[PDB]
Amino acid sequence: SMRPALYFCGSIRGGREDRTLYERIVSRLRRFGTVLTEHVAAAELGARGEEAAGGDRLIHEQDLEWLQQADVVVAEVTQPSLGVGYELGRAVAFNKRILCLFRPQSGRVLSAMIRGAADGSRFQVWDYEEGEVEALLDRYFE
Amino acid sequence: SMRPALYFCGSIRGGREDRTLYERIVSRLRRFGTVLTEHVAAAELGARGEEAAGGDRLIHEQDLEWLQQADVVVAEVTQPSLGVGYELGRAVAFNKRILCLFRPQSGRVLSAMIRGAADGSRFQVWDYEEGEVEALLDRYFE
Numbered sequence: 001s002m003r004p005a006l007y008f009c010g011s012i013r014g015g016r017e018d019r020t021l022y023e024r025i026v027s028r029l030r031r032f033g034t035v036l037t038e039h040v041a042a043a044e045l046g047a048r049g050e051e052a053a054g055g056d057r058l059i060h061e062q063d064l065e066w067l068q069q070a071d072v073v074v075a076e077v078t079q080p081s082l083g084v085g086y087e088l089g090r091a092v093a094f095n096k097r098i099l100c101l102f103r104p105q106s107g108r109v110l111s112a113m114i115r116g117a118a119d120g121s122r123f124q125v126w127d128y129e130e131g132e133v134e135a136l137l138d139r140y141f142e
Numbered sequence: 143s144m145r146p147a148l149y150f151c152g153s154i155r156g157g158r159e160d161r162t163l164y165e166r167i168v169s170r171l172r173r174f175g176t177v178l179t180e181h182v183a184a185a186e187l188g189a190r191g192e193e194a195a196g197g198d199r200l201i202h203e204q205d206l207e208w209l210q211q212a213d214v215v216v217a218e219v220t221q222p223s224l225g226v227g228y229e230l231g232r233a234v235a236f237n238k239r240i241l242c243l244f245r246p247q248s249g250r251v252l253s254a255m256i257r258g259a260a261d262g263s264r265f266q267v268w269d270y271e272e273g274e275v276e277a278l279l280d281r282y283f284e
């Protein structure tokens with residue numbers, strides 16, 4: 001590809017509390033590649049609306065196509081989410097380069113299944129504070 | 143094996159709101175096989191305590207051994223959880239028999255990545271109300 005393919009994960013039906021931060025992360029990711037999930041992140045129809053359209057199977061299948069295309073999977077894992085975890089599980093089995101970003105100031109303890117999936121190279125989990133997200137992404141993609 | 147191996151998924155670090163229901167589900171699952179995750183579900187040390195022991199990598203690796211042994215993976219997916227989603231993602235890639243149980247009375251809309259993973263046979267997602275969980279499990283394992 002002429003540009004790296006990037007897949008961004010962040011809670012949607014798990015809760016939209018961090019939606020604005022995800023947009024900030026995706027904006028910085030665009031400096032480093034094409035973000036395949038960019039335009040379906042907002043879920044403008046609402047969860048009930050998407051369910052009512054009967055589109056969840058297409059959401060699963062299309063997102064799994066993008067996940068396999070991805071050169072890097074980037075996940076913000078502060079807000080617990082079934083879909084984010086599922087994307088990470090599929091991505092590990094696809095042997096993907098994976099970066100998870102977690103905010104300790106949330107007061108949560110991150111899932112042991114995500115923290116313990118890390119090997120410090122191909123699956124990396126970084127703690128961070130919100131103000132330094134651009135600097136960390138620059139470091140990861142340099 | 144002389145008994146089926148069962149792997150039960152339910153939120154822990156995502157939140158313990160449904161812990162009592164999980165115990166009820168696991169008690170009924172014991173009628174149908176060995177529940178490999180039974181005795182580590184309570185997390186008595188606490189999330190901070192387990193993290194402080196440095197045990198998250200062992201939690202990941204040991205649970206992945208049980209997940210591959212499992213004849214059936216049963217997940218209660220009402221409470222959003224990274225670990226539950228991750229277990230389901232790994233289980234799909236292992237081509238596991240999977241049953242997810244979701245309570246619409248939660249007022250949540252279930253993750254499209256879980257609802258849309260279903261194919262109605264090997265990956266099944268059932269809506270239910272809490273009082274009928276034993277009857278549904280009897281039906282699934284009959």
Ligand SMILES: Nc1ncnc2c(CN3C[C@H](COP(=O)(O)O)[C@@H](O)C3)c[nH]c12
Nearest residue numbers: 009010011012013014043081083084253
């Ligand atoms: N408009 C939309 N509606 C539902 N799902 C998606 C997705 C797929 N994944 C879900 C995951 C959060 O998972 P969850 O929804 O369980 O919190 C995110 O990383 C992206 C993209 N756009 C979507």
Ligand SMILES: Nc1ncnc2c(CN3C[C@H](COP(=O)(O)O)[C@@H](O)C3)c[nH]c12
Nearest residue numbers: 111151152153154155156185223225226
């Ligand atoms: N004592 C313990 N501490 C941490 N993890 C585990 C597990 C492994 N999975 C995690 C998943 C919830 O995931 P999450 O913690 O992200 O909500 C559950 O289905 C079981 C068993 N015992 C544990």
